[PDB]
Structure formats: C-alpha cells, structure tokens
Amino acid sequence: NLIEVFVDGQSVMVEPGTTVLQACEKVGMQIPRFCYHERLSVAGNCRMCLVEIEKAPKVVAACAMPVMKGWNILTNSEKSKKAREGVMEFLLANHPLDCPICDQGGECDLQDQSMMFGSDRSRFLEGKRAVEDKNIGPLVKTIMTRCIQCTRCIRFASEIAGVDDLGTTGRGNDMQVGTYIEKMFMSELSGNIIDICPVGALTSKPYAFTARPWETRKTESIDVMDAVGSNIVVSTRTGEVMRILPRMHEDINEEWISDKTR
Amino acid sequence: KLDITTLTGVPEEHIKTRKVRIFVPARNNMQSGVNNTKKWKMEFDTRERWENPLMGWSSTADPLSNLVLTFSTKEDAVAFAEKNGWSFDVEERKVPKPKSKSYGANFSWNKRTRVST
Amino acid sequence: KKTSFGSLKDEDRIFTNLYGRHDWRLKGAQSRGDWYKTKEILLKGPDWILGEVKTSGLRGRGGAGFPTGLKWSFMNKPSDGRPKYLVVNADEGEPGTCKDREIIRHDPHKLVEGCLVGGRAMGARAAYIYIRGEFYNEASNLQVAIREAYEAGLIGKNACGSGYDFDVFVVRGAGAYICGEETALIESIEGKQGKPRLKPPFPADVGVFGCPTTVANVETVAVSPTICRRGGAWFASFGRERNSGTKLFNISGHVNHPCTVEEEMSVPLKELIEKHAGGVIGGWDNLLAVIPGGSSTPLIPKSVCETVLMDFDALVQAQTGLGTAAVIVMDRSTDIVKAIARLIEFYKHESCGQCTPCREGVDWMNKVMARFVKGDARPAEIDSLWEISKQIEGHTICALGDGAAWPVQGLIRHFRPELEERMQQFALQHQ
Amino acid sequence: LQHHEYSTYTFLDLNVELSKFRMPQPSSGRQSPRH
Amino acid sequence: GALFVHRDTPENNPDTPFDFTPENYKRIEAIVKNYPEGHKAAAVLPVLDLAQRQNGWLPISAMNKVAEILQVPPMRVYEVATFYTMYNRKPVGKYHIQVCTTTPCMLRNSDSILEAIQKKLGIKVGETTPDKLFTLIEVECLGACVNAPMVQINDNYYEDLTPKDIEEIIDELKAGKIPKPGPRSGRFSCEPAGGLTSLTEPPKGPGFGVQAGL
Numbered sequence A: 001n002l003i004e005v006f007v008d009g010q011s012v013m014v015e016p017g018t019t020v021l022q023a024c025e026k027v028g029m030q031i032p033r034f035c036y037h038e039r040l041s042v043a044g045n046c047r048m049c050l051v052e053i054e055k056a057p058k059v060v061a062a063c064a065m066p067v068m069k070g071w072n073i074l075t076n077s078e079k080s081k082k083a084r085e086g087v088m089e090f091l092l093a094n095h096p097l098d099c100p101i102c103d104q105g106g107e108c109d110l111q112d113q114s115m116m117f118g119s120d121r122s123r124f125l126e127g128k129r130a131v132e133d134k135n136i137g138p139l140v141k142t143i144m145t146r147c148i149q150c151t152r153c154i155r156f157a158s159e160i161a162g163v164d165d166l167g168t169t170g171r172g173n174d175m176q177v178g179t180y181i182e183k184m185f186m187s188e189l190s191g192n193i194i195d196i197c198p199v200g201a202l203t204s205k206p207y208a209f210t211a212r213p214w215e216t217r218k219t220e221s222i223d224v225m226d227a228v229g230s231n232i233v234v235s236t237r238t239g240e241v242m243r244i245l246p247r248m249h250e251d252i253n254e255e256w257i258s259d260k261t262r
Numbered sequence B: 001k002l003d004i005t006t007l008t009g010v011p012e013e014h015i016k017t018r019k020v021r022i023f024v025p026a027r028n029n030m031q032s033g034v035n036n037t038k039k040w041k042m043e044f045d046t047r048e049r050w051e052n053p054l055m056g057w058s059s060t061a062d063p064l065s066n067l068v069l070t071f072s073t074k075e076d077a078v079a080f081a082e083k084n085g086w087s088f089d090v091e092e093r094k095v096p097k098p099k100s101k102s103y104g105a106n107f108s109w110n111k112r113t114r115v116s117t
Numbered sequence C: 001k002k003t004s005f006g007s008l009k010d011e012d013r014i015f016t017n018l019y020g021r022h023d024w025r026l027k028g029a030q031s032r033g034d035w036y037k038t039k040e041i042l043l044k045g046p047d048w049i050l051g052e053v054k055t056s057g058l059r060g061r062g063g064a065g066f067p068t069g070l071k072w073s074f075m076n077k078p079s080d081g082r083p084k085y086l087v088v089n090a091d092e093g094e095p096g097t098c099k100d101r102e103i104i105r106h107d108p109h110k111l112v113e114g115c116l117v118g119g120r121a122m123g124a125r126a127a128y129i130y131i132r133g134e135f136y137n138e139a140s141n142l143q144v145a146i147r148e149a150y151e152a153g154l155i156g157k158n159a160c161g162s163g164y165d166f167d168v169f170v171v172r173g174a175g176a177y178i179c180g181e182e183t184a185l186i187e188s189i190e191g192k193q194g195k196p197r198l199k200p201p202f203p204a205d206v207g208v209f210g211c212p213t214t215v216a217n218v219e220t221v222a223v224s225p226t227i228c229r230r231g232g233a234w235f236a237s238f239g240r241e242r243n244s245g246t247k248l249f250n251i252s253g254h255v256n257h258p259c260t261v262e263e264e265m266s267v268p269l270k271e272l273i274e275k276h277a278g279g280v281i282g283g284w285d286n287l288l289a290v291i292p293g294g295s296s297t298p299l300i301p302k303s304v305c306e307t308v309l310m311d312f313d314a315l316v317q318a319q320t321g322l323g324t325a326a327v328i329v330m331d332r333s334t335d336i337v338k339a340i341a342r343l344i345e346f347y348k349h350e351s352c353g354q355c356t357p358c359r360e361g362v363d364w365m366n367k368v369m370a371r372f373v374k375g376d377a378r379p380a381e382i383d384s385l386w387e388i389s390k391q392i393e394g395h396t397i398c399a400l401g402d403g404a405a406w407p408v409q410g411l412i413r414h415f416r417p418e419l420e421e422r423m424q425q426f427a428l429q430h431q
Numbered sequence D: 001l002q003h004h005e006y007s008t009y010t011f012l013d014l015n016v017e018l019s020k021f022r023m024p025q026p027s028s029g030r031q032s033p034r035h
Numbered sequence E: 001g002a003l004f005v006h007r008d009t010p011e012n013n014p015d016t017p018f019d020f021t022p023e024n025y026k027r028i029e030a031i032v033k034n035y036p037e038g039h040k041a042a043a044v045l046p047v048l049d050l051a052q053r054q055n056g057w058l059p060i061s062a063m064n065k066v067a068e069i070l071q072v073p074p075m076r077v078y079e080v081a082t083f084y085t086m087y088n089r090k091p092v093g094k095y096h097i098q099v100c101t102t103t104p105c106m107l108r109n110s111d112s113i114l115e116a117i118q119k120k121l122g123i124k125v126g127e128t129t130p131d132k133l134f135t136l137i138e139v140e141c142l143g144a145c146v147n148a149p150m151v152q153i154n155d156n157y158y159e160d161l162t163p164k165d166i167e168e169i170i171d172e173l174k175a176g177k178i179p180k181p182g183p184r185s186g187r188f189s190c191e192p193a194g195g196l197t198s199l200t201e202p203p204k205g206p207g208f209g210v211q212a213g214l
C-alpha cells in the first residue's frame, strides 16, 4: 500500500512507516545525520536530522518521523538549513580542537558535515568541557573528550554485539558514555565500534597515528580468516598494508568484520 | 569492434597484461556519506612497489598505477575498456537494501526489540 | 457571560481540604463529599465520563494545557490485547509549583477517586502515581489513603461494586526534574534513565511497558470526580471560554503572604496577588517582573501585570504562559538577571543531555548568563544569546529546552536595558 | 500531622500490605525481553 | 562535583559486603509484584532506593546485587544510579541537609539559611562534618517553594525557616531529638500567613450540587 509523499516537490511512493530520511534517500537526498545508523535502532539524539515539512510549524527529525501521505519534505528550506547550523554549532561548542592530531581527521563526519551544513565561524566564547578517558580494551584507543554522545556505540553493543557493558552515566552536559566500572569491552565485533563512531572518540589503537585517509589506496578484497567470506577493503599506503576496513555486502556481512579480520 | 589500441600509443605489455576493474567504489565505512558511491570507476591492477635505496620512498615501474577513470554507467566503462583493448572485470553495483525502521519498536511490550537503555 | 472573574465561594472550591485543617483520611473525604455515588459514575460509561470532561472544557494542569477531554478520548479505542494504564504525574518539579504537594498531602482520596474515574474513562486496568522522591511523607500519606480505599473496596476487584477491576500503584521518583516529562516519566517507571522519548510514537499508542498510557497532572486527575458529580457545565461556568475551571495558584516570591489559593481561571493577577497573597512586599509599586506560570513561562513586566488575566490564552497574548499557574513575584529590590540566571542554572542541572541542543546550549546559556550577572560581556552578546535560545527552542526533543529558552527570551525582551547598564558599569569598573 | 512520624520502610511496608489487594498482573508472554 | 566514573577503592570495591535483609527481600518481592511480569526491570529504582535506605549509601556491590536480583545488566543499574540525584554513590552523613537554592527559595533569602548552616556546622557546602552526622548540599526546587526558605533532611521538610530556626533544628538533631517536619513559623501549610482567605466555611458535604442525571 504505497503512499505518495513529496520531497522538494518530487513525488515518491514509499511504503507506510517509512521514515522521512528514507524517502529523502529514495529521491537521492542524504539528510545529514550523526546518531542514525540504519543497522542500529533509531535514537533521535543527534538532532542534525531536523528537516522542515511544508505547512508544519515545527521541524521534525527525519530519522525518527514516519512519513504521512501528502507531506512535502523541504530538505533545503531556510528553516532546515538554520536548524542544521544550530545543531552543528552546539556539537562543536565543546568538541576539542583535536583535528590535526585526531586519527579521524580527514574522514570525520563531524568535519564534513560542518563544512557542508554548518557555519564557518564559532560564537562560543567560554571554556570547553573535558572528560577523563576510559579504558575499554587493548584494541580501541579512547579519547572521550571528542565524544558527541551520538549513542551509536551503546546501541551497537546492545543490539549487534549483544554485550550490555557500554552506557551513559550522568545527566546534562556532564553525561559520559562508557563503562561506569573499569570493565573491558570484549567481543568479536568490538572493533566495529571504531568504524561506527562518527568522531575520533573511539579509534583503532594499532592503527593510531600511522596514516591519514587521503593518503591511503583502497583495494577491495575478501577476508580469509573465517569461512564467512566477509568483504573487506585493504587500505595500503606506499606499498604497505595500513588497516582493514569492512565492505558492505548485505548477504554476507552487512557492515561488520570480526576483530581477527580487522 | 572499435579498436583504438594502435592509436593510443600505449605499449603492448600494458595493453595485454593488465586487468582493469570496473566497479562502483564502496562507501568508506568510517563515514556515513554516500556521495562517493554514485559513479562507476575504472581502476588498473596493482603491480610491484619497492623501496628506494636512498630514502625508502616507494618506487614503481607501473605507469598506470594511479590512473583511475570515472564513468556514469557500467556500459560506458565497458565500452571504453573494449575500445582500448583492456581485459575488464565488472563488479555489479551494491545498493543498500531497504530497511524497516520504527522508533516505536524500541518500546515493544512483548517483542525483543525493546532497548535496555 | 460574566466579564470579570476572580471571586470564588467556598461552595465551588473543589479542593475543600486544601489547607489540611479537615481530616485527610477516608472518613474526612467522605464527609467532605468525596467517593460519593462513584458507582453510578463508573456504571454510566466511558463515553459519558469523557463527554462530561469535554463539556467541562478542562485544560491540562501540568502546564501544556491541552484539552483534557480529547487527550483522554485518544485512549478510548478498543483494546488490542495489551493492558491500558493511567499515569498521574506528581513530579512537582517546576520551580515555584507546590499545588500537587498540597493535593496529595491533604486530599489524597480526591486523587484516588479521580484515578478510578479516569481509568474507567480510559479503560485502564491500573494507575501508577509517580511521586517525586523528595515527597516521601506525602507519598506515605497517599499510600495510607490507597490502603483505606482498598479496605473499603473503593478500589481493587469490583471497585465500588461497579464490576470494574482497578488498581493504583504509587511509584516514587529518585530526584529528577526531567521525570516530570510524560515520556520521561514513562521511561522512569519502566526503570531506565528518565530521558524523554520521541513524540511520533504517541503515548496513547505506546506508553509505559509499551502499552497505551495517558499522563495527566495530579490536579487534572483530582478534579475529574468533582467535575463528573457536579456536572461539566458547572466547571464550564467559571472562567472565560476555552479557559473554564477553577485553578490552584501558588504565589511565591516577594509577597507579604506567600500562599497557595484556589480561584476561578482568568482572575486578574493583581486581584490574586493583593486579595490572597497579602500584596507585594513594599506595595504594588515595588512590583517587578512577576513570573506568571513557573520558571518555564517567560516573565512579564509590572505594566502587563497590572491588567493581565490569569488564563491560558490571555497570558499567551502577554507573550507568557499560564504553565503550572505558579506565580513568582519579584520586588524592585531584586537582581532580575540573577534570578533568571539561577533559573537557567536549575535547567542546566536538570537536563538529561540526550538531545544535543539541550545538552550543549543550556550550559552555554548558563555560562553566558553568569557572565551577564557579573557584567563581563559585550552588548551584542544579548543578541547572540537570543539567537542561541531560538536555536534551542523548537529543536529539542524534550520541552525542557524550550522551558529554558523562554526565560532567557523574556528577560531579554523586557529587561535588555538593565543588562546593557550592567555591562557598561562593569566596563567602567575595570577600565 | 500523621506525616510527622514515618519510618524509612513505611512506604515499602504499605506496598507489602497492598500486595494482597492487588489484582493479577498482565504478562508479556516472555520471562524477559532478553529471553 | 561528583565524578560519574567508579574507581575501585578498598571501601567501595566490588567485594564490599552488602546483601538485603530478609524483610527487605520481602519488600523487594512486593515491589516486583507491582510491575507486570516480563518487565521486572521496572523495579530498579525502588530496589535501589531500598538498598540506599538499608545501607545509607550505594556501593558498587549494592548496585551489582540489585542487578543480580532483578536479572538486569549491571550497566543499566549504574546508569540509573548515576542519572538520579537522590541516590548516594558515596557515604554521607547521618543527616543530609539539603538546602533549596532555586530562584523561588532564593527570593526568600535562602542564602541566609545556607550561611547559618555553614557557620553552625563549620563545613562548607558539599562537605561532611568530621562527626559524620551532617552533610550539607544545595538542591533545586523540592516542591515546597511557597513555604520558602525550606531545607530537607533525611526524609523531612523543615520549611519557612529563619537562621535561628535552622540553628535550632541542627542543635536538636545533634542532641538526638527528632524535630517535627513542617513550617517552623506560625503557619501550618500553604495557608496564607495572616489568615485563611479561602475555605473558611465548613465543607458542604456529600451529595452537594450533584448532577441530577447520575
């Protein structure tokens, strides 16, 4: 029972229950996101998915709003752009100036979305917050000061990994992600939180400081550690293998690889 | 049956002994953006890279090591490869399958989709 | 048809035992008219109860003020096999608000009979009354009243002999203002962090334990039995159109006699302050920036306070809100900037943090306001703060963000000259 | 005036007393969502 | 200023002995009976309150015990403990003095009461007396804004306070005498100080103004 909705005036037929963001994907528009991962559950905390629906006073989160018949999604209206700029400013208000030394630098969703949907200057005239780093294991190098509380790691650990050890402690601006205790996040799919993290809060310890994204040459290959046959991308620079990244194959491995493969 | 191989000036070894890969680049899993996955790409096979004795810089003898081409459709890339006489391998485009997302499911009364946090 | 409201006789006062002088136990409530012919009301049917509420024109007393009848009728749909629940919001977290505390402490059986009536209207098996954890003694009193009602058979199996099975559970909070939010309240009852959900899945369809659940403020539930017994037109008689009913008012701050009083809606603010609260300290001339309906509602300067009427739509025209109907009064011997900054600090300490606008912007506003009270800022920071508040408002998934933005907007709009004067004085001091 | 004298376990003890009057609870059909 | 990460200490190690008393176990069973079957995780907050009441503060072992009893992941219990202010994750004094310093209470010179408490106890806010009988903490609106000033102790509201009143209450607690909660001024409740401007007449009684068609 496909219903008709409009994205910037273009008719697109979507099944009922489709999120606004998914219809925008149907017409090709990629709504900016920070907390929404299609594999994971919807959370609606990034607030970057706030888009304006025609004749609706209040903007809605595309990731969490099911479409209604006859809705016109204005993805580039002034309200949508202003909401995106405000959310980006709030995200970058406390974020540390770690881009040159952050391993995520060059492949950071925060950086790119700031360059594309955010302001080019900062009005923040106060001190930034700092968070003590947590140790979650020998694989994931953690700098929580860079975290944006997107909650991707938590939801991933709960749903895909199945290990309910990562959670949010505190309230308000002092809210911190991570084990309240000195527990170590151990799982086969533990390394995938590095990939899932938009910011360089969670990064690969063996890969740390080794190379920058633009240098690397990407070669698409298949892993041999297991008989699953996960598709991987072998990132090589100057003839040396630098890291192994998952490659999407919905039938075999959705977007994940084992720790041994990684 | 178009053949520009004689006219290109490429030496025969790279015309015959090189396998060119036609594909749509997969999304860099580190990022959620998908804009870099909308155009077909033609990439040549990787060859030997060795360290320069003096400085340790990676040296190559493959002229087409860095050559990459962008094509709107698979057929255009195939036609270009055929006209240039390069053996080609085509990897079919991988699209994310549609997913059913419900924020309500996070608070199911009886289903297992309920989220602990 | 009356053009001037503001005088309510003791006969029409719903909360007869508001001050607690009469007995709060079951005997006192029954003597005062509570639990009277409740069986007939339940047997009349859900539709008649909902229609009585709709005719009453009751607006939600939590602060949002949605039409109570339609809000409850949302639950009237036939059951899908899942249970239905009614949650009475007793968080009482809005600063300046003390009405629900009096209701639970001194007239608990009113709330219990209201829960029974509403659950019958909503077709709910049980009701959970979420009480602020700091309200331990009031929670114990409510538990005692629930026990008495169970002993009398008013609640439980065959409640009031109506063949309807209803239970009231009291759940105590753990000290979070945000739990006052209906979705946050639902999550807190479910045992998770009290972080409000997203609206698209409405509480009517999915609520506590993933079941149909309606959240109503203590006053809204408590007035339901009296609205049913006396009649919807009786409630409609008091107050203006769309603002019908008698609303508890909490007058605090720089008033000679701080008190909580019940009066008809649309009562003039001056009349309420002078008649019941003993007048402003130093007289009405000393009045400055009354908070109309609690911290969330923006302040109104004295000039508006002279002629404003305390009802939803009228105060909305005053760029403010009725809110929780809590009136906070400041004399001219008050640093309005300091009061508003303290309120924003309250909001900072009470934010969940899940929504990025709230999590970062609220702290940003608190720091900016602290610099303002110090005077250590440039004039354009006023406009910068206004734009920050506008960004926070309407984007936050919860309404605490708007609740925080609104005080800042009101303070700017009505007292920018004081801010600029303090900045200039600071600059002169430091040279 | 009764509220002046309440102990730490007063609320919980009142809940224990009320347990008997409580009606049967509804069941999701599973021991836990994790089950 | 309290941290939201747990550093294991000899007093607060996971091996710190804590277990519910059998009476508290029965109370827990009654609590679990309240919520529907299959959602026993809803009991986390009341059971944590019970543990804090039993022990006076919540050690990590207590949180783990709550998690075990309710069969929920321990991280959920940690999140609940950290999120809600009432839970004490550190040992606190015998009497916990909580002063409401929000704007309504502030207008009624709550800072005077706070300073009086500091001088009498000798401890600054957020500190515990060396005798470990008094811990002073400022809090937000406690719900008694009309009767400001108001300070809370372990479970009781001492509202409508003056510096002499708070000093007297502290002296009574030090002596072991239990002060009566409520307004320490003349008023008994939210009632107007001068006199009742409402509800002066006796209650109307049952059957008053009842709609005929019911």
Ligand SMILES: Cc1cc2nc3c(=O)[nH]c(=O)nc-3n(C[C@H](O)[C@H](O)[C@H](O)COP(=O)(O)O)c2cc1C
Residues within 6 Å of the ligand: C059, C060, C061, C062, C063, C064, C065, C066, C089, C090, C091, C092, C093, C094, C177, C178, C179, C180, C181, C182, C183, C215, C216, C217, C218, C220, C398, C399, C400, C403
């Ligand atoms: C941040 C926040 C705090 C709230 N606190 C309370 C509260 O303490 N008590 C209350 O009754 N409603 C509170 N509310 C309003 C509730 O979310 C909800 O609207 C109310 O319980 C509905 O009552 P009503 O049906 O009478 O309108 C709060 C809302 C927000 C956004």
Ligand code: SF4
Residues within 6 Å of the ligand: A095, A096, A097, A098, A099, A100, A102, A103, A104, A105, A106, A108, A109, A110, A111, A146, A198, A199, A200, A201
């Ligand atoms: S994670 Fe933060 S510090 Fe690192 S590159 Fe991205 S924006 Fe810069």
Ligand code: SF4
Residues within 6 Å of the ligand: A146, A147, A148, A149, A150, A151, A152, A153, A154, A177, A196, A197, A198, A199, A201, A202
């Ligand atoms: S650590 Fe990374 S993945 Fe986890 S909440 Fe923070 S930003 Fe998101």
Ligand code: SF4
Residues within 6 Å of the ligand: C178, C195, C196, C350, C351, C352, C353, C354, C355, C356, C358, C359, C396, C397, C398, C399, C400, C401, C402
């Ligand atoms: S607006 Fe603030 S308090 Fe409300 S849900 Fe969002 S983060 Fe929490």
Ligand code: FES
Residues within 6 Å of the ligand: A033, A034, A035, A036, A043, A044, A045, A046, A047, A048, A049, A050, A061, A062, A063, A064
């Ligand atoms: S990620 Fe879409 S609303 Fe936050």
Ligand code: FES
Residues within 6 Å of the ligand: C094, C095, C096, C097, E100, E101, E102, E103, E104, E105, E140, E141, E142, E143, E144, E145, E148, E150
């Ligand atoms: S302002 Fe003091 S109790 Fe709320």
